[PDB]
């Protein structure tokens, strides 16, 4: 399965098994025996607009 | 009005059963030895 979304820059540390915070609490929660991989890259020029 | 053999038997057993119960208040290198306080002061992982 591939899940996709957009978050802040310093919220990428809550996408991991066993974390807390406004993102992992109630936006997107990863089980505690996760198996896959997590990939993330900056996208300032595409998503941020004056 | 002697019976130390039987007595010995009886005792050897009560003293070995007392140690098993006393071994429940030891952390063995955890924070505490009571399964709730460890459980209501940390999160599962």
Curated annotation (Swiss-Prot), chain A:
Please state what the protein is called. Answer: Spike protein S1
Q: Which organism is it from?
A: Severe acute respiratory syndrome coronavirus 2 (2019-nCoV)
Q: Which gene encodes it?
A: S
According to the UniProt record, what happens if one changes residue 22 to N?
In strain: Beta/B.1.351, Omicron/BA.1, Omicron/BA.2, Omicron/BA.2.12.1, Omicron/BA.2.75, Omicron/BA.4, Omicron/BA.5, Omicron/BQ.1.1, Omicron/XBB.1.5, Omicron/EG.5.1; May enhance affinity to human ACE2 receptor
Q: What is the effect of changing residue 22 to T?
A: In strain: Gamma/P.1
The record describes its quaternary structure and partners as: Binds to host ACE2. RBD also interacts with the N-linked glycan on 'Asn-90' of ACE2. Cleavage of S generates a polybasic C-terminal sequence on S1 that binds to host Neuropilin-1 (NRP1) and Neuropilin-2 (NRP2) receptors. Interacts with host integrin alpha-5/beta-1 (ITGA5:ITGB1) and with ACE2 in complex with integrin alpha-5/beta-1 (ITGA5:ITGB1). May interact via cytoplasmic c-terminus with M protein. May interact (via N-terminus) with host bilirubin and biliverdin, thereby preventing antibody binding to the SARS-CoV-2 spike NTD via an allosteric mechanism.
Result of changing residue 13 to S: In strain: Omicron/BA.2, Omicron/BA.2.12.1, Omicron/BA.2.75, Omicron/BA.4, Omicron/BA.5, Omicron/BQ.1.1, Omicron/XBB.1.5, Omicron/EG.5.1
Q: What does this protein do?
A: Attaches the virion to the cell membrane by interacting with host receptor, initiating the infection. The major receptor is host ACE2. When S2/S2' has been cleaved, binding to the receptor triggers direct fusion at the cell membrane. When S2/S2' has not been cleaved, binding to the receptor results in internalization of the virus by endocytosis using host TFRC and GRM2 and leading to fusion of the virion membrane with the host endosomal membrane. Alternatively, may use NRP1/NRP2 and integrin as entry receptors.
Task: Show the segment(s) annotated as Integrin-binding motif.
Answer: 8-10
């Amino acid at each position: 399965y591939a899940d996709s979304f957009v978050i802040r820059g310093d919220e990428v540390r809550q996408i991991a098994p066993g974390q807390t915070g406004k993102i992992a609490d109630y936006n997107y929660k990863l089980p505690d025996d996760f198996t896959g991989c997590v990939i993330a890259w900056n996208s300032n020029n595409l998503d941020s607009k004056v | 009005s002697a019976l130390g053999k039987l007595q010995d038997v009886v005792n050897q057993n009560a003293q070995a059963l007392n140690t098993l119960v006393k071994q429940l208040s030891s952390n063995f290198g955890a924070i505490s030895s009571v399964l709730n306080d460890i459980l209501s002061r940390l999160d599962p992982p």
